[PDB]
């Protein structure tokens, strides 16, 4: 009894407070602002962002990111990160004035993929009980439309790339997936039911479960091509592409996808590699994400974690390559979308006695960040003392309206705790972190499917 | 030397002061939230709001003031509020739903006086210096909108008053009213000049004096002519009025405006004095505003000073007599359009610590506060316990969106340091100060024509 | 334009306060007092007011101090908030010189509590300039080749250096048929800075 009481809310308390606090200046202004305005509108503070949003960067990539990207409403930031830094390439070689790879032809197949993975992960643990963390949590939300960098490769290593021009973001779904991916969802929702069902007498080889499972994959298709039409070409198959280069010159070029995205995009789909600054874990180990996926049988999410030193000299280092770099972050905690300014000390919340002394580690074990958006860093300014970077310049999937011209300016604090993982290629990285990879030796650090370094949805 | 060197702006100065504020909590917030927003918007105090926005009256006129009126883009307000005294008269007597009697009707008439009235004040200062305070004052805004209850008198007393249904609003002119004063103000500018000239070898009682001022009327009234109609009816011409009262049943008034002034507004041009505080002279004597006008030889300008004790007595009084009182404030002071409050302290201004000692009688000597609007309380709210009035309610002409559905509340503070004038009926009056008005003992206090207790413009 | 928008507005604020004590032996509705009373805050000027805050102040790149805060693009309010607290120090400062001369240490500490409010409510709605006149900053920008450069330079030098800013050259001609041509014409009492250039034309 005493201790609840104690641990009550204790009416003669909270006046008595009140009156103490209201017996404070700072508090009798911050009370009357607060009830005025959105607590980020009223703290902004401009003393630091003249200071702040510098957009001049010593070390930047050759080629322009022509034309700004608009994911519109879905969480397909990481297929426009993953293609912006790709698109470059085509852009630079082939003489053009605005190039896009097709982002929509990435979804279609990530999302029918997604599906259908999401049909053996019930399979495989039809043995646990329905109102299990796992089963409930692959029931949550089947077909979003985040992933990350290795369900990316997954998609390329199947399905090639192929121009925008060739597939766009014509249909509505692919600017407003939502109402598209609760109609596939709810369906999913029917099916885990029928296959859990069908499988407490029958093991998952019977002929009927397979059967089953076929006519899941069929209604699954069949629902899709309802909002969006299956890729013109198949992966093997050849597709003609006309354009027009800087010059005013007509050029056709005759490939298939899973050939274009070797030859024009300069992927090899062999050599990139994700870093990750999980402080939760020692530096050096790998990290693995248990059961997330899109294709069945695809590479598995894996990390090198390593401290933010070596993090942002790789950044430093691929820039310098010519290079941007895709990357993982906390969207959108300290991001101010208005002026492009990602900086953790841009609000003035100290002025209303609002401090934060949660450590990283802690804030993502404590349920406070993770990953939640990919974007871009096609620059940076090193300071000329021998210092390290300052800040990044970075290309979000927004549309030109959003932040300067569709470009953010992300400091090296915020870098270094808003931010999780980046991608490299692995001749980048030193022998001694390389070897990581290339060994057969390393162990890594198995996460459950639920861990907040995931997916960037 | 040494007094110029004290009395600069010295450098090290401001930035050593700037450290020390920056040292105070209180004032870092308020640079932050100060540099984001508006003054007035941010320091909105809403805890005073919600006790202050009450509109619970007990004391209140019998009928309803609709519809709500416009002045729009004009300054009219004195006509809106003298006419919206008496309209009530015409909704109560006649059984109507809505009624207004004509603004435009008095603002034609007005301005056409006005400029009559400005050639005459030329033509009696040309003995005077052009850039003497006098003359420029008068060449300054000759035709403004603007005016006093007298100067409401004086016209009613050679034009009267028609409904709306004759003459409404439908020029352009009479909501937007600044381009057509530029015209006219422009042209008497020119005619000033002429005038002054032609008086330089003749005296004003001259056949070419007089000649030319009729000229000078005769186009005026042409320019006018083409911005607004002159009315429909002559002061003592028959006019056909027809309508319906609430009950739908039609009728027709046949009348004139004189005789629809006295029979149907009920105005008895000889009852109405003006009350004033106005704290720079003694209480008890007369104030008169030399050479402020509109009809030539009409009623001057002339308020009994009366305490605010007496004024908020005669207030009271007056509603309970079941008329609404005419008044002149200083708006927008201390006026939220928004939720239609007038509260001093409605803002939290000494949280940024800015306050404000300077009383009444010395912010209206030191250019800070002056007459500005006319407004109508049609009800107040006395304390049961034998207290005095603690808010007042108030219908300004700037229609229903603004404000309350156009209505406004104000305290009893804001009424004793931002309002000045009220008006009431003479019987009103305690013979004590009724008498101020009938003997012929009083010499009045005399004030130039450019003191801030003049019309309500 | 906020560097010299921020200096012109204090300097007028101070300005204000010295043209109320030159002035106060003349009566509160006098021609000259109404008229500084009415608007001394306002954010007009002239060619020399502008020389003035030049030679003092020098100038910036707008990189470093912009038109970010709300008072710089809406003015209004700030300037009505200044003037009422400066009509309230005319007063004080005029009663106060009723019993005692200018040169009173009284008085002189009174004007300094004024300068100190004054500047004091200038900061909530403008930061004073990042540097000082004499005092060095660093200036990071692009050229049209994409090249990136960095300027360090003080407000004052930047001004004659790299403005091309003489203020020894200019002069204002008018053309004011009211008075003879080839004659000097001079605005008594207009201002910014205390002791700076008067406005002077020649017609």
Chains 1, 2 share one sequence.
Not at 47 to 68: G, H, I, M
Request: net charge neutral.
């Amino acid at each position: 009894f005493q201790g609840a009481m104690s641990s009550s809310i204790d009416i003669s308390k909270i006046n008595s407070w009140n009156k103490e606090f209201q017996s404070d200046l700072t508090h009798q202004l911050a009370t009357t602002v607060l009830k005025n305005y959105n607590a980020d509108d009223a703290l902004l503070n401009k003393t630091r962002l003249q200071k702040q949003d510098n957009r001049v960067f010593n070390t930047v990539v050759s080629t322009d990111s022509t034309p700004v990207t608009n994911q519109k409403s879905s969480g397909r930031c990481w297929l426009f990160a993953a293609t912006n830094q790709l698109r470059l390439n085509v852009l630079s070689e082939l003489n053009l004035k605005e190039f896009e790879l097709s982002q929509a032809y990435l979804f279609f197949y990530d999302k029918l993929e997604k599906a259908n993975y999401f049909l053996d992960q019930i399979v495989s643990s039809a043995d646990q009980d329905i109102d299990s963390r796992l089963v409930q949590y692959l029931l949550a939300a089947p077909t979003e439309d985040g992933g990350q960098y290795s369900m990316f490769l997954n998609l390329v290593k199947k399905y090639g790339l192929i121009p925008k021009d060739l597939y766009g973001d014509l249909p509505y779904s692919t600017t407003a997936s939502r109402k598209w991916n609760s109609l596939l969802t709810t369906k999913l929702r029917e099916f885990a039911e029928t296959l859990r069902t069908a499988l407490k007498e029958r093991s998952a080889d019977d002929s009927i479960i397979v059967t089953l499972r076929e006519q899941m994959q069929r209604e699954i298709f069949r629902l899709m091509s309802l909002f969006m039409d299956i890729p013109p070409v198949q992966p093997n198959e050849q597709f003609t592409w006309e354009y027009v280069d800087k010059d005013k010159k007509i050029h056709t070029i005759k490939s298939t996808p899973l050939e274009f995205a070797s030859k024009y995009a300069k992927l090899d789909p062999s050599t990139p590699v994700s870093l990750i600054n999980d402080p939760r874990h020692p530096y050096g180990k790998l990290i693995k994400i248990d059961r997330l996926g899109n294709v069945l049988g695809g590479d598995a999410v894996i990390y090198l974690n390593v401290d933010n030193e070596t993090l942002s000299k790789l950044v430093v280092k691929r820039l310098q390559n010519n290079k941007a770099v895709f990357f993982g972050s906390h969207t959108p905690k300290f991001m101010d979308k208005k002026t492009g300014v990602m900086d953790i000390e841009l609000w003035n919340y100290p002025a209303i006695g609002y401090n934060l002394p949660q450590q990283k580690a802690s804030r993502i074990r404590y349920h406070e960040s993770l990953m939640t958006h990919a974007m871009l860093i096609t620059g940076c300014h090193v300071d000329e003392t021998s210092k390290l970077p300052l800040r990044y310049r970075v290309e979000l999937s927004w549309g030109k309206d959003s932040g300067k011209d569709g470009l953010y300016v992300m400091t090296q604090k915020y870098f270094e705790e808003y931010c999780f993982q980046i991608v490299v290629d692995i001749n980048e990285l030193p022998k001694e972190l390389a070897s990581k990879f290339t060994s057969g030796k390393e162990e890594p650090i198995v996460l459950p499917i639920w861990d907040p370094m995931g997916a960037l949805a």
